[PDB]
Design a binder for this molecule. Structure first.
Ligand SMILES: CCCCCCCCCCCCCCCCCC(=O)OC[C@H](COP(=O)([O-])OCC(O)COP(=O)([O-])OC[C@@H](COC(=O)CCCCCCCCCCCCCCCCC)OC(=O)CCCCCCCCCCCCCCCCC)OC(=O)CCCCCCCCCCCCCCCCC
Ligand SMILES: COC1=C(OC)C(=O)C(C/C=C(\C)CC/C=C(\C)CC/C=C(\C)CC/C=C(\C)CC/C=C(\C)CC/C=C(\C)CC/C=C(\C)CC/C=C(/C)CC/C=C(\C)CCC=C(C)C)=C(C)C1=O
Ligand SMILES: CCCCCCCCCCCCCCCCCC(=O)OC[C@H](COP(=O)([O-])OCC[N+](C)(C)C)OC(=O)CCCCCCCCCCCCCCCCC
Ligand SMILES: CCCCCCCCCCCCCCCCCC(=O)OC[C@H](COP(=O)([O-])OCC[N+](C)(C)C)OC(=O)CCCCCCCCCCCCCCCCC
Ligand SMILES: CCCCCCCCCCCCCCCCCC(=O)OC[C@H](COP(=O)([O-])OCC[N+](C)(C)C)OC(=O)CCCCCCCCCCCCCCCCC
Ligand SMILES: CCCCCCCCCCCCCCCCCC(=O)OC[C@H](COP(=O)([O-])OCC[N+](C)(C)C)OC(=O)CCCCCCCCCCCCCCCCC
Ligand SMILES: CCCCCCCCCCCCCCCCC[C@@H](O)O[C@H](CO[C@H](O)CCCCCCCCCCCCCCC)COP(=O)(O)OCC[N+](C)(C)C
Ligand SMILES: CCCCCCCC/C=C/CCCCCCCC(=O)OC[C@H](COP(=O)(O)OCCN)OC(=O)CCCCCCC/C=C/CCCCCCCC
Ligand SMILES: CCCCCCCC/C=C\CCCCCCCC(=O)OC[C@H](COP(=O)(O)OCCN)OC(=O)CCCCCCC/C=C\CCCCCCCC
Ligand SMILES: CCCCCCCC/C=C\CCCCCCCC(=O)OC[C@H](COP(=O)(O)OCCN)OC(=O)CCCCCCC/C=C\CCCCCCCC
Ligand code: SF4
Lengths: 71, 70, 156, 83, 115, 318, 174, 105, 98
């Protein structure tokens, strides 16, 4: 169950980031929104920068350090 | 006699009671009357995060059940 | 007045602690230091009153000059007295420290430690009994009780 | 043999700490090879499911692979249950 | 985060105690009071002169044995492996080599302080 | 609320340290046929307060030859680490729940060693230097033996988590399982806390007050508080490690009472030992650990590695 | 973000500047102890609690021996501190200035050194999204020293035993 | 120079530890296991020269997974453009990016 | 590459420049030598932990072990030099010439 929830949540955050990138990088001359940095078309696991990039520092900190700092 | 040592030992014991009991009470106070969740592993941490997400009040200890699924 | 009352209570608190925690330096010179051992002994337990021997002069409040002070020892006694941090008190025990003693008219003896250090209490005897030294210690405590440093400062 | 006994008695009178140390170390080295429960410890370690048991794609020729967890096929921990 | 806050609290409390100690009481300082202590007489030499260490070899052996115990510390997790025989063999190998080092030094008189 | 918890962990420990000073004075007095403090307050209950007030209202002096920066830092480091050692202890709930609660204790103790060394060196006096080097040798010996003993006993546990220690000792006592390691651990804790017969860093008979000879007033009181806090903390760790109390999750006060009683018993045993025995020579202390404890410790470490395997009793990892 | 790893790395570099300016082995050991503790913090943030605590404990033990040795072997009448000497203070200030310059350049722009290219962004950005479950990957990998790595244990133990023999032989004299 | 005693005797002394796509305890995967596997399979059996000439795409993907330089460049560019747009008030972040949403479990 | 790696490599470079620039004491250079291996340990564990190279987690421990062996060797040589010359100064190691 948690695997399915994780997949849905990750894909949703990726789609939201893509929409915000489309809104932002609309006047950049040479910029294609959603372009991959890998030659291969295989699915690549996102890093924390790709998911919690355009989000609040609270969410960023919880995602990146919440487990390690939880004592 | 030797029992005049006891009041000092009694005071020292009373002082040593405070930390543990205070920690227990504060753990129950800030976790909804339950034990503070132990998260020694990423699985337990992810469970806590999911509990925070589903609660709707941004607090993992607010537990939801069948009345919430339907 | 409010400030007068506050400073009185404050120096009562400060004098109580100093009188109730006395830390003599382990400093014995002659036969008078055996009666000091007997004051430390179970019969007249000095630790009962809050009086504890410490070896370092830096951690000592009272110097009990117990024994004959010689010309070859006076520099060392003054040195350890100076190295005691303030507030510091001196109890001169027995005839040899009070004045000359049996060795007053001698080429090698200082006629009283009060030529070297400021003495607060003089305990007479050769040697003073352990009860006599204990009486001197309690008299020193009562002398500390009458100190009014903050009361002098407020009116200063 | 007599020399061995004399040496041991001298050591027990002079270095009981060293005698005890060597006895404990020697027993620690030797006993595991004779214990019948070493294999049980290995089996208990193998039986711990740290990660997910990814299922196999059924080809129709896997009679020893269960179709359900509660099917009779598959490893059994009944030995560990009564242990 | 919580551990950082705890360390900050402890350090701040200790520093406040030092500050109160050095600023509350009346101070009277002079060259004789602050002189070094050597039982009533002046020190002949300096406290910064070399001070012979009679156990210099035991210190080096301590460095080596300290890293031996650093090797030994992850044993509680090593006991969860399926290769129990190999794990036990290597653990006993390390401990036996440590014992061999101790025996060699002891018999060669490395544990005796210099005279 | 966590700051309130930190205060609730700190202040009671300092109060317990003061009354441990009182209790030690009275226990030694009665073992020496005296009475100890009974004049200052009712049964001498205000004696620690009087001593603390006197020390912090007395004048602290910096020696002319001292290095002032590390002269000041050393008591700060000592007291800070003494207060820090308490945060992972489960009573029954730790303030800070660490996955490796034991290695944290070892590391912080090894750090707390350096307060003695730096206070002795920065004082710039011969007696202080001698006390510092006695500390160096003492730490050598006790450190190696302590690490091996902890490894073995925690190998009977399964991990380095003290709550897991409670769960392990749910049924019987680790002291019943491993009493030889318990004896060597107790001796090593004495050597680690610098308690008699191992009070060599501050040995009044040989050195005039050892490493803190040049310390006065408040900075001396900080070293005293740190030493007594370390005594209580090590006894608490020993009680948790070898005398496991029963835990009821719905009434955690029972575990707290049991833990406090066991800790007090061990601390009073420390005072008893100080009253009973003479003082070692630090070379004989080094020869005791290396030539007596270390061989037995290595043999018992081998035994306690092999025993779970040969009997199929390997503890769970979590 | 909170830049905790960056702040700790800066303190790490500062401690290195200290003991490499080399005032005297007492303060060199003090700076090395500070750097060891700060590096323990850095790797604790990155994930390795055992590795951090282990390096901290090992360096605490190692610097204890160095104190005793510098008391006996490497001491002089007036031990040098950072402000006591012109050379020591010059080197310390040079190191601090270099660290400050590089930190400022990296924060202001993506600084490419003459050796390596560095991007000024999140240490939190570089992390991985995935997680483990009910075990510590670092602990399991370290514990694999006994199941795997039989060869490493053999060479390491042989080296330690020969190290004891060597230190006994070097200091023999005669 | 290199005496391949391991290959000759069938031993395994450090080849287990050489790569992160090898057998790991509890089957824990590396961060770039798939990329490293693809590069190794591409470069197997053709030597260093041809492997560097021909498996360059796979190696570039592997290095990108390892170091994440292009990804950080893209993220920094997006961050700079967003900050510039916010400075002049031309862009408004959505509530789900400002923290006014309920994510999935 | 993050700035953390830059700082760790900078610390290694500082410790290397410290070793190569002796002043008088051999002990200070030994401390500079111990700092280099500390920076190597930190850099290696940062690289390994980030990439989830599980089997490489034991490498920093071996690195520490051989750091200890080097430190022991250096201290032994230092005590021999000090016994011969009275000080650990590097100016006394001038009997042999190039
Ligand atoms: C995680 C922590 C990270 C920290 C940051 C990173 C640290 C990296 C390592 C160190 C690198 C360099 C540090 C700065 C050096 C500054 C240059 C220098 O020489 O300073 C003078 C001073 C040397 O003077 P001295 O010879 O000792 O005193 C004689 C006077 O010169 C005689 O002159 P005087 O008597 O006229 O002057 C008196 C004055 C002189 O006061 C000072 O010199 C103060 C200097 C403070 C530096 C703080 C940094 O002293 C006072 O007034 C007494 C109070 C001040 C000193 C005590 C408190 C200091 C702050 C703590 O430098 C030092 O003593 C260096 C101390 C560095 C301490 C750092 C923290 C230690 C933590 C230990 C535990 C770690 C656990 C693991 C983590
Ligand atoms: C020179 O020849 C001679 C000899 O040959 C040497 C001799 O032998 C002798 C004979 C003498 C002997 C034989 C003596 C030998 C005897 C012995 C060796 C044994 C005797 C015993 C000792 C020596 C032990 C000595 C011990 C001492 C001195 C310890 C005393 C020191 C202290 C108590 C100070 C340290 C404690 C402190 C600082 C306590 C601090 C506590 C706190 C700060 C806690 C408070 C914290 C807070 C945050 C406060 C706020 C709290 C709140 C608000 C809570 C309140 C809330 C409520 C609800 C109440 C003679 C005469 C001689 O001549
Ligand atoms: C039940 C299981 C029992 C298993 C066997 C007994 C337990 C294990 C014994 C060996 C332990 C080795 C380490 C112990 C430390 C001491 C040591 O090494 O001594 C060596 C020493 C070696 O010295 P030595 O005896 O060889 O000295 C030389 C002797 N001559 C000259 C004759 C050759 O052994 C002794 O000193 C022997 C006397 C003490 C031996 C132990 C007595 C008690 C044994 C247990 C009895 C009760 C068991 C439980 C029964 C009831 C259960 C409900
Ligand atoms: C227990 C651990 C923590 C301890 C914390 C502090 C414990 C003690 C608390 C009560 C202290 C009472 C004041 C004692 C001051 C020292 C006395 C002295 O030097 O007298 C001689 C001097 C004499 O001054 P003078 O001007 O007459 O002398 C001139 C100099 N000679 C001697 C050469 C002539 O007294 C003073 O200077 C008085 C200063 C004001 C006193 C009151 C201020 C302090 C009030 C304290 C309230 C509590 C909170 C703040 C303190 C810190 C705690 C949080
Ligand atoms: C807001 C506070 C500002 C000031 C902070 C000052 C910090 C100074 C020390 C820096 C290094 C230690 C903190 C690193 C950052 C946090 C690490 C972290 O998240 O740890 C979680 C971990 C959690 O423990 P864990 O190992 O169980 O983690 C795994 C389990 N999870 C992930 C679920 C938490 O904490 C620890 O492991 C504790 C280790 C503490 C190590 C401390 C080393 C340095 C000691 C310095 C002592 C100085 C004494 C005073 C000297 C004064 C002299 C005058
Ligand atoms: C060579 C001799 C080896 C001897 C090894 C054993 C040494 C024991 C040293 C004990 C020191 C205790 C110091 C603190 C005192 C605390 C007092 C207290 O609160 O007690 C109440 C406490 C009760 O609080 P409790 O909850 O902590 O006790 C039970 C704890 N559990 C169940 C969680 C493990 O203890 C008891 O009332 C019972 C104590 C024994 C518990 C273990 C099970 C029974 C074992 C019976 C067989 C014993 C065989 C050996 C006997 C003879 C040994 C020579
Ligand atoms: C450890 C942490 C401490 C932190 C600081 C807090 C301090 C807490 C306050 C402690 C107060 C202790 C009170 C001491 C009570 C004195 C006991 C009584 O006996 O004293 C009497 C009176 O003593 C003094 O007159 C007063 C001392 C106590 C009053 C101090 C002032 C009030 C304290 C409150 C602080 C001040 C603030 C006031 C407003 C600013 C004299 O008796 P004494 O002669 O010796 O006994 C001899 C023995 N005999 C009887 C057998 C012969
Ligand atoms: C493992 C050791 C062999 C390694 C050889 C490496 C090259 C040689 C360098 C020396 C290293 C080893 C030196 C250890 C022995 C040297 C000390 C010695 O000579 O005496 C040993 C001394 C004897 O006492 P005396 O000589 O009579 O002196 C007392 C006089 N009243 O005591 C000993 O025998 C201890 C020897 C080592 C203790 C451990 C014994 C090891 C036995 C276990 C088998 C090891 C197999 C390794 C695989 C382990 C698999 C589980
Ligand atoms: C550094 C932080 C500022 C400390 C206050 C000012 C420093 C100072 O003057 O030293 C006070 C005192 C020593 O002064 P003396 O050299 O003996 O001569 C003056 C006597 N009053 O030192 C201190 O109290 C330092 C305060 C603790 C530092 C906390 C840092 C952690
Ligand atoms: C019952 C069966 C028991 C089997 C084992 C019997 C006892 C074995 C050896 C007993 C003691 C032999 C050691 C030699 C001896 O008797 O004492 C001599 C001498 C004591 O003289 P000292 O005064 O203390 O030192 C200065 C000398 N001027 O001892 C020595 O020299 C040291 C030699 C032994 C070193 C021990 C090092 C660690 C060995 C124990 C570690 C754990 C055991 C390892 C297990 C491996 C083997 C299974
Ligand atoms: S006064 Fe009498 S008893 Fe005291 S030292 Fe002099 S001769 Fe001895």
């Amino acid at each position: 169950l948690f695997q399915a929830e994780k997949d849905r949540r990750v894909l949703q955050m990726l789609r939201e980031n893509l929409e915000e990138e489309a809104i932002i990088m609309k006047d950049v001359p040479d910029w294609k929104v959603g372009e991959s940095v890998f030659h291969t078309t295989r699915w690549v696991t996102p890093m924390m920068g790709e998911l919690y990039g355009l989000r609040t520092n609270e969410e960023i900190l919880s995602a990146t350090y919440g487990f390690i700092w939880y004592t | 006699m030797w029992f005049e040592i006891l009041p000092g030992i009694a005071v020292m014991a009373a002082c040593l009671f405070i930390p543990g009991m205070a920690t227990a009470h504060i753990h129950k106070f800030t976790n909804g009357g339950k034990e503070k969740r132990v998260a020694h592993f990423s699985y337990q941490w992810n469970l806590m995060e999911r509990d925070r997400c589903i609660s709707g009040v941004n607090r993992y200890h607010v537990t939801k059940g069948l009345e919430n699924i339907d | 007045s409010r400030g007068e009352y506050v400073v009185a209570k404050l120096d009562d608190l400060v004098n109580w602690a100093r009188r109730s925690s006395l830390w003599p330096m382990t400093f014995g010179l002659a036969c008078c230091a055996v009666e000091m051992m007997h004051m430390a002994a179970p019969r007249y337990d000095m630790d009962r009153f809050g009086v504890v021997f410490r070896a370092s002069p830096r951690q000592s409040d009272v110097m009990i000059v117990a024994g004959t002070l010689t010309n070859k020892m006076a520099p060392a006694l003054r040195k350890v007295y100076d190295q005691m941090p303030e507030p510091r008190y001196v109890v001169s025990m027995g005839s040899c420290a009070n004045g000359g003693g049996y060795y007053h008219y001698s080429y090698s003896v200082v006629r009283g430690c009060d030529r070297i250090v400021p003495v607060d209490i003089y305990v007479p005897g050769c040697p003073p009994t352990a009860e006599a030294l204990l009486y001197g210690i309690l008299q020193l405590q009562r002398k500390i009780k009458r100190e009014k440093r903050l009361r002098i400062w407020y009116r200063r | 043999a007599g020399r061995i006994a004399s040496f041991l008695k001298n050591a027990w009178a002079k270095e009981p700490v060293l005698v005890a140390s060597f006895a404990i170390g020697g027993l620690a080295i030797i006993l595991p090879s004779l214990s019948p429960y070493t294999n049980y410890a290995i089996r208990i370690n193998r039986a711990t499911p740290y990660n997910y048991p990814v299922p196999l794609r059924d080809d129709g020729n896997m009679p020893d692979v269960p179709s359900h967890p509660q099917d009779p096929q598959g490893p059994s921990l009944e030995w560990l249950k009564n242990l | 985060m919580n551990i950082m806050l705890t360390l900050l609290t402890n350090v701040t409390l200790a520093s406040l105690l030092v500050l109160i100690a050095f600023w509350l009481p009346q101070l009277n300082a002079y060259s004789e009071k602050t002189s070094p202590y050597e039982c009533g007489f002046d020190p002949m030499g300096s406290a910064r002169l070399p001070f012979s260490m009679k156990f210099f070899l035991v210190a080096i052996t301590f460095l080596l044995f300290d890293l031996e115990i650093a090797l030994l510390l992850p044993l509680p997790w090593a006991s969860q492996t399926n290769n129990l025989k190999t794990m036990l063999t290597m653990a006993l190998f390390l401990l036996i080599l440590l014992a061999a080092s101790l025996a060699y030094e002891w018999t060669q008189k490395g544990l005796e302080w210099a005279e | 609320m966590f700051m309130i918890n930190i205060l609730s962990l700190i202040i009671p420990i300092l109060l317990a340290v003061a009354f441990l000073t009182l209790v030690e004075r009275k226990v030694l007095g009665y073992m020496q046929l005296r009475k100890g403090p009974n004049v200052v307050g009712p049964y001498g209950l205000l004696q620690p307060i009087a001593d603390a007030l006197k020390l912090f209202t007395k004048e602290p002096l910096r020696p002319a030859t001292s290095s002032i920066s590390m002269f000041i830092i050393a008591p700060i480091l000592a007291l800070s680490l003494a207060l820090t050692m308490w945060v992972p202890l489960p009573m029954p709930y730790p303030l800070i729940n660490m996955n490796l609660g034991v290695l944290f204790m070892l590391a912080m103790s090894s750090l707390a060693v350096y307060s003695i060394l730096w206070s002795g060196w920065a004082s710039n006096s011969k007696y202080a230097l001698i006390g510092a080097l006695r500390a160096v040798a003492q730490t050598i010996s006790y450190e190696v033996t302590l690490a091996i003993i902890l490894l073995s006993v925690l190998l009977m546990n399964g991990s380095y988590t003290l709550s897991t220690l409670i769960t392990t000792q749910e049924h019987i006592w680790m002291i019943f399982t491993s009493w030889p390691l318990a004896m060597m651990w107790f001796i090593s804790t004495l050597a680690e806390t610098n308690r008699a017969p191992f009070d060599l860093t501050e040995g009044e008979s040989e050195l005039v007050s050892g490493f803190n000879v040049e310390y006065a007033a408040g900075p001396f009181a900080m070293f005293f508080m740190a030493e007594y806090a370390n005594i209580i903390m090590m006894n608490a760790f020993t009680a948790i490690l070898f005398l496991g109390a029963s835990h009821d999750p719905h009434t955690p006060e029972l575990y707290t009472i049991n833990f406090v009683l066991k800790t007090l018993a061990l601390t009073i045993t420390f005072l008893w030992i100080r009253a009973s025995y003479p003082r070692f020579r630090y070379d004989q202390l080094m020869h005791l650990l290396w030539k007596s404890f270390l061989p037995l410790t290595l043999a018992l470490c081998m035994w306690h590695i092999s025993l779970p395997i040969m009997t199929a009793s390997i503890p769970p990892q979590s | 973000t909170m830049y905790i790893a960056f702040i700790l790395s800066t303190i790490f570099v500062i401690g290195f500047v200290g003991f490499s300016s080399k005032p005297s082995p007492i303060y060199g050991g003090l700076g090395l102890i500070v750097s060891g503790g700060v590096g323990c913090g850095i790797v604790l943030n990155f994930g390795g609690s055992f590795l951090g605590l282990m390096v901290f404990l090992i360096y605490l033990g190692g610097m204890l021996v160095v104190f005793g040795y510098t008391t006996a072997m490497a001491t002089e009448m007036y031990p040098e501190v950072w402000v006591s000497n012109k050379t020591v203070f010059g080197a310390f200030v040079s190191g601090l200035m270099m660290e400050f310059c590089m930190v400022y350049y990296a924060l202001k722009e993506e600084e490419v050194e003459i050796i390596f290219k560095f991007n000024g962004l999140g240490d939190w950005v570089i992390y991985d999204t995935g997680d483990s479950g009910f075990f510590s990957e670092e602990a399991m990998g370290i514990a694999a020293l006994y199941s795997y790595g039989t060869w490493l244990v053999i060479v390491t133990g042989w080296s330690l035993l020969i190290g004891v023999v060597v230190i006994m032989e070097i200091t023999r004299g005669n | 120079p290199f005496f391949d005693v391991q290959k000759r005797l069938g031993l395994d002394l450090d080849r287990w530890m050489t790569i992160q796509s090898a057998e790991q305890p509890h089957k824990i995967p590396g961060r770039c296991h798939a990329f490293e596997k693809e590069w190794i399979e591409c470069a197997h059996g053709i030597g260093g020269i041809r492997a560097e000439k021909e498996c360059k795409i796979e190696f570039d993907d592997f290095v990108e997974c390892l170091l994440r330089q292009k990804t950080m460049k893209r993220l920094s560019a997006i961050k700079r453009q967003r900050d510039k747009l916010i400075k002049e008030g031309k862009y408004t972040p959505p509530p789900h990016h400002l923290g006014k949403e309920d994510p999935r479990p | 590459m993050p700035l953390v790696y830059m700082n760790i490599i900078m610390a290694f470079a500082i410790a290397l420049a410290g070793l190569l620039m002796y002043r008088s004491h051999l002990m200070s250079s030994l401390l500079c030598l111990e700092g280099m291996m500390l920076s190597l340990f930190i850099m290696s564990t940062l690289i390994i932990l980030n990439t989830h190279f599980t089997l490489a987690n034991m490498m920093p421990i071996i690195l520490l072990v051989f750091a200890a062996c080097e430190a022991a060797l250096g201290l032994s040589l230092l005590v021999m030099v000090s016994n011969t010359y009275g000080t650990d100064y590097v100016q006394n190691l001038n009997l042999l010439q190039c």
